[PDB]
Amino acid sequence: KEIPDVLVDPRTMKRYMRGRFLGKGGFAKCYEITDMDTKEVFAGKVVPKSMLLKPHQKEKMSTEIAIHKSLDNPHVVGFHGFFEDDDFVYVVLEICRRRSLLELHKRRKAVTEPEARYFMRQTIQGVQYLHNNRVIHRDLKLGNLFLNDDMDVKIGDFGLATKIEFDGERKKDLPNYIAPEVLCKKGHSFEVDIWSLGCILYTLLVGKPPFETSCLKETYIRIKKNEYSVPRHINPVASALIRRMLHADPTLRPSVAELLTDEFFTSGYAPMRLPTSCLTVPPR
Ligand SMILES: COc1cc(C(=O)NC2CCN(C)CC2)ccc1Nc1cc2c(cn1)c(C)nn2-c1cc(Cl)cc(-c2ccccc2C(N)=O)c1
C-alpha cells in the first residue's frame, strides 16, 4: 500500500513531507522526513499495521517506543514523537547523516587505536545514561551506533531493550553479540551490554567480529564455549580490557563506570573530535 507524500498526525498536528528513502530494517522502512512548517529534518521509521496484525508483535514496538520516548541524551537518538494513520505506524527520530559505525567498519576494516578510543568513549557514555536510568539495550551493534555530520556516536534501535523494575532483577525472556548467559537461559542483566561493547571494541580494533563464522549455529557454540583470541598484534593494555569485557562470568565484566577510567582510554592519544574523512581513510 502507498505511503503518503505528506505525513500528518491527530496529535502534534504537524505535517511531515516524506523525502528520500534511507533504507530498511526488518519490517521497518526509513525515509528522510522534513517538517513542513519548520523545515527541520528527521528520520522517520515507517511500519505497516499489516506487519503488526498480531497483538504480540504490536507490543514489542510499543515497549520500544515507551522506553525510547523517556530518553534524552547527546549519545542516544533523540526521540521526537510518534503517531499512526490507518495503514502505517510511524516513529519520528533524530537524523544521522553519516549512516552507522558498521558502514564505517566495513569500509575501513581495522581502525586506528585513537579512533576506537573516541568511538568507544562516546558509546560507553550513552550506555552509562542507559544504565543510570535502569535500561538495558541488549542488541548493541555497529548498526545501532549512529553517526551524524559531527561524527558523534548516537545509540539507536531499542527493539530488544528492556527497563529493570526492581533492585536485583534477573531477566529470562527475549540480537548480534549475545552473551553466554543469554544463551544458557541462566538469566541476564546489565552486564550483557558490556559484552556487546567488548565485542564492538574488538571488531573495531581488529577488523573482524570476534565470533565471526560463516554458519549461524557455529557462532552460538563459539560464544557458549568462550572461543575467541585477540591476535598478538594488539596492544596488551587494549587486549586486557577486551578480555575483561568479554569474561565468561558476568559478575566480573567491568561496570559501565569502570570502563572510562580503564588504562586503555587514559594511556594513549584520545582525540575529542574526528573528521568525516575517517569514514573512508585513516586520520593523519
Ligand atoms: C542521511 O543519512 C543516511 C544515509 C543512508 C544511506 O546511505 N542510504 C543509502 C542506502 C542504500 N540505498 C541504495 C541508497 C541510500 C542511510 C541512513 C541515513 N541516515 C539515518 C538513518 C536512520 C536514522 C537516522 N539517520 C534513524 C534514526 N534510523 N535510521 C535507520 C533505521 C533503520 Cl531500521 C534502517 C536504516 C537503513 C537505511 C539504509 C540502509 C540500511 C539501514 C539499516 N538497516 O540500518 C536507517
TrEMBL record:
**Domain of life assignment:** Eukaryota
List of residues binding ADP = 22, 26, 45, 94, 96
The Protein kinase domain, residue ranges: 16-265
Q: Which residues bind ATP?
A: 45
Q: Which residues does this entry mark as bearing Phosphothreonine?
A: 173
Q: Provide the protein's localization.
A: Cytoplasm, Cytoskeleton, Microtubule organizing center, Centrosome; Cytoplasm, Cytoskeleton, Spindle; Midbody; Nucleus
Question: Which region is the signal sequence?
Answer: none
Family in the record: Belongs to the protein kinase superfamily. Ser/Thr protein kinase family. CDC5/Polo subfamily.
Name of the protein in its database record: Serine/threonine-protein kinase PLK
Taxonomic source organism: Danio rerio
Q: Which residues of the full protein are shown?
A: 24 to 310 of 595
